[PDB]
Amino acid sequence: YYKANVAKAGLVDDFEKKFNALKVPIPEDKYTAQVDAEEKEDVKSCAEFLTQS
Amino acid sequence: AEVSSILEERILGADTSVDLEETGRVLSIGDGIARVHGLRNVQAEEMVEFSSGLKGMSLNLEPDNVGVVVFGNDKLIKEGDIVKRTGAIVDVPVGEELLGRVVDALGNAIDGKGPIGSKARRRVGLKAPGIIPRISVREPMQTGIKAVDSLVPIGRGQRELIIGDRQTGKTSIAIDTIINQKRFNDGTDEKKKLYCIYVAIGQKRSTVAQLVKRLTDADAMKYTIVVSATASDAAPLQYLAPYSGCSMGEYFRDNGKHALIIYDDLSKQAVAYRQMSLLLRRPPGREAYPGDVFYLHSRLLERAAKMNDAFGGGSLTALPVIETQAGDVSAYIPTNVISITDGQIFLETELFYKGIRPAINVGLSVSRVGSAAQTRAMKQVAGTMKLELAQYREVAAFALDAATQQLLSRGVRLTELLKQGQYSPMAIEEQVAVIYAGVRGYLDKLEPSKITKFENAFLSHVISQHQALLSKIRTDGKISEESDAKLKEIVTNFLAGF
Amino acid sequence: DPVQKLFVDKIREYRTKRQTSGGPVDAGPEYQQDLDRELFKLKQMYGKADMNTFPNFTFEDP
Ligand SMILES: Nc1ncnc2c1ncn2[C@@H]1O[C@H](COP(=O)(O)OP(=O)(O)OP(=O)(O)O)[C@@H](O)[C@H]1O
Ligand SMILES: [Mg+2]
């Protein structure tokens, strides 16, 4: 419909095709470095605190 | 290129036929009223036309001349002009073709967007349905405001009245009601779809434009008609806009569908009628309003019926909006319309500024249908809420013992529960969840300044984690024992976890 | 239908305009002044982005 309602159908076709080809990025888990903390907890909870308790 | 082609397409089809038509000469034109001489066979309240394509209504049939009111501007009509009778009582287009279109009081498209494809016309001045066609109001009209759906419920075929001062939140209630119907209109069953009509009388064009864009943003013009007779439209148009809109809704209710119409305001239709009547020289009455000022409204609000299943089963709800002066509900038009309508919704500025929004004065607001036209879950919960607020309002003017202290606590918790924002109507099951949480002593622990935070967070949590429970409540339409136990555990868990 | 001399007259004037529409005839300076004014207003209301193609993003992670 839209390209049927525009004069320079070529330009809108170009935008449509560029949209189709081009995608968007996605973040990562670098800010999830807190992964490390979990292991540390295993020490107090399961190794240290558990044992002396 | 094709622009001129489509331009020609219009000329290609024209009106060749010239007929021998009766006429009359304008003896005197001034203030919007013409006194035609001739038109010996013109009917009463018939539509006539002027030499410049401008319409009018023959309202007065005196022996020597016909008093005609011009549906438009008056500078273009001269003396000795020509008035041709169209031989048809005033009527307007009707049909689903009008949905999503802004039209003027006479059914002319006002937003561009081409013409109306209506295949049928209906007379504005039609008699109300008799006593036999109707049937008691059964279904609920879901408004989305907690305080209206719980404490002053509205059925389909009822005629509520939204009465208050200027800038207390009346049009806001109207728009919330219009927007809420989106969930039902998007669904599949046609027994819940409700087509909305908004008659804007005397409102400046900027206000109606804001309203129309607000409806478009909420994607609510798929099923809304807007009949705008704004301030700059001659009085004969603001007088007739309510009747045009009511005919557009009469079509729906007569074709088995459901419609909702919102006259906004009727206190300005009364003023336009008074101006017309005073310029036709009819003697004034009390406050200068004509004698037939009650009739004006009673014949209009009596068309909001609830047809029985033999006449289609369709319905037409009405929500007239009145505007009082400094809360003087005792005025003339307010009292007329209060004695015409079924329910009322009193908005008060003292409540608007005290933080209670919508300002609905639950103490005075009434609804004759009451019990009927309320879902079973809401009926169960809002009853206890109503009793609790009724008791609270008695002992409220002050602020000891545990029993009355807890009574005040519960009343205040419920009060802050009923507040709401703008253009965010709630599904009925969500309202039931919130009111159930509030009324079952759960919020009595929380502070009253944090109740809004709870309400909001609880809604956001339930709408995602417990969509299944809300679907159950909606489908079964009651708080069953298992549903009650669930609700109990969800609320108990959430309260502590917050 | 071939009798409404003004019907065919209007059609004839329309045809002549169609033929003569190489450039807006009788445009006058008002044509350009308006065109510019409302194009400018639309440009403001929409935006000042790169009015040929897709602007790029370069988003930022949390
Ligand atoms: N539930 C609400 N929460 C917050 N603000 C509200 C609410 N309802 C209304 N308002 C405010 O009240 C103002 C007036 O609203 P509205 O137009 O609905 O009242 P009104 O009486 O129809 O006004 P008028 O009669 O002058 O047209 C709005 O600016 C709006 O911000
Ligand atoms: Mg308003």
Side-chain angles (χ1 to χ4, degrees), chain B residues 244-389:
Chain B
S244 303
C246 186
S247 285
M248 318 209 190
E250 279 183 19
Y251 166 92
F252 291 108
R253 81 150 155 68
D254 279 11
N255 292 16
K257 293 156 160 31
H258 300 252
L260 170 76
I261 185 163
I262 296 158
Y263 319 102
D264 185 353
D265 300 1
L266 288 188
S267 56
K268 287 149 187 183
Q269 191 217 1
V271 167
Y273 184 53
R274 153 168 85 182
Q275 154 168 8
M276 292 176 70
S277 279
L278 283 176
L279 300 177
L280 289 157
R281 309 292 301 189
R282 306 194 169 160
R286 194 213 302 199
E287 278 193 14
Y289 292 107
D292 291 331
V293 75
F294 171 93
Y295 186 39
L296 176 77
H297 287 147
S298 62
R299 74 163 158 213
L300 158 74
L301 292 156
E302 285 279 308
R303 287 145 80 153
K306 164 53 171 292
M307 301 285 117
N308 64 352
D309 293 81
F311 286 66
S315 68
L316 163 62
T317 317
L319 301 182
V321 172
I322 297 282
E323 174 150 309
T324 74
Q325 298 293 318
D328 197 32
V329 164
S330 178
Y332 188 30
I333 304 304
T335 52
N336 292 8
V337 181
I338 289 170
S339 68
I340 282 154
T341 57
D342 295 17
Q344 327 172 30
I345 286 159
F346 278 105
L347 283 72
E348 308 189 321
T349 51
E350 311 94 8
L351 275 46
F352 196 84
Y353 296 118
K354 266 165 39 170
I356 297 140
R357 292 169 217 91
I360 294 146
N361 184 5
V362 298
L364 316 181
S365 310
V366 65
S367 186
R368 274 92 165 100
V369 310
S371 185
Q374 217 174 14
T375 60
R376 204 201 221 271
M378 210 78 210
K379 209 193 286 276
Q380 285 165 13
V381 186
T384 81
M385 171 167 73
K386 208 188 163 287
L387 277 296
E388 290 181 23
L389 282 72

Side-chain angles (χ1 to χ4, degrees), chain B residues 15 21 56 120 182 217 250 255 260 391 398 418 436 438 465:
Chain B
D15 70 320
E21 53 204 348
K182 185 192 154 46
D217 288 10
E250 279 183 19
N255 292 16
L260 170 76
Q391 292 179 356
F398 58 66
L418 287 170
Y436 184 90
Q465 287 69 240

Side-chain angles (χ1 to χ4, degrees), chain B residues 111-122:
Chain B
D111 47 352
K113 286 194 78 202
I116 318 292
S118 72
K119 322 300 190 323
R121 288 174 93 68
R122 204 198 184 72

Side-chain angles (χ1 to χ4, degrees), chain B residues 398-413:
Chain B
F398 58 66
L400 287 171
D401 46 346
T404 300
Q405 170 56 305
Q406 178 270 3
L407 166 56
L408 262 54
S409 84
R410 192 77 78 73
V412 171
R413 266 81 196 174

Side-chain angles (χ1 to χ4, degrees), chain B residues 18-209:
Chain B
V18 300
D19 209 352
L20 197 80
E21 53 204 348
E22 320 189 32
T23 44
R25 298 292 298 273
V26 171
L27 299 182
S28 172
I29 180 70
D31 308 318
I33 312 286
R35 294 295 200 172
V36 179
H37 158 93
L39 290 160
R40 280 309 311 188
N41 306 284
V42 74
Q43 301 176 325
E45 311 156 24
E46 159 173 352
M47 181 145 268
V48 301
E49 166 165 40
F50 288 90
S51 77
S52 53
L54 178 58
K55 299 277 146 58
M57 183 188 289
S58 70
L59 264 189
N60 263 20
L61 298 205
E62 289 139 25
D64 46 333
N65 59 39
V66 185
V68 175
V69 306
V70 189
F71 290 142
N73 196 356
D74 170 67
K75 83 203 178 290
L76 271 183
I77 302 155
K78 263 151 71 66
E79 177 181 357
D81 216 13
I82 298 279
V83 192
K84 304 163 269 280
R85 60 187 294 282
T86 55
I89 309 308
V90 181
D91 48 6
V92 302
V94 294
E96 304 215 299
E97 292 81 8
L98 278 160
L99 299 190
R101 306 303 311 284
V102 186
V103 299
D104 63 358
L106 264 178
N108 283 324
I110 283 283
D111 47 352
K113 286 194 78 202
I116 318 292
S118 72
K119 322 300 190 323
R121 288 174 93 68
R122 204 198 184 72
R123 274 150 64 157
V124 300
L126 265 178
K127 191 72 152 36
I131 184 179
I132 287 299
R134 322 204 172 206
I135 187 66
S136 51
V137 164
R138 321 185 162 295
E139 304 96 5
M141 204 269 307
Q142 313 280 25
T143 284
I145 295 90
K146 295 187 287 293
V148 174
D149 279 25
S150 88
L151 288 164
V152 55
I154 304 143
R156 305 201 161 181
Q158 171 161 340
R159 303 158 292 145
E160 209 72 14
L161 175 78
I162 315 168
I163 175 160
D165 308 74
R166 64 179 176 86
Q167 292 254 317
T168 55
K170 323 194 284 286
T171 297
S172 293
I173 289 176
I175 299 288
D176 291 331
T177 315
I178 292 166
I179 278 168
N180 191 11
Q181 316 315 311
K182 185 192 154 46
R183 62 193 82 238
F184 307 97
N185 287 317
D186 279 9
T188 61
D189 60 352
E190 271 207 280
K191 298 291 180 68
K192 311 288 275 284
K193 303 187 67 164
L194 185 71
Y195 309 116
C196 304
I197 312 174
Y198 186 79
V199 190
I201 311 152
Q203 314 190 146
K204 58 178 212 315
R205 261 160 202 153
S206 302
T207 299
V208 175

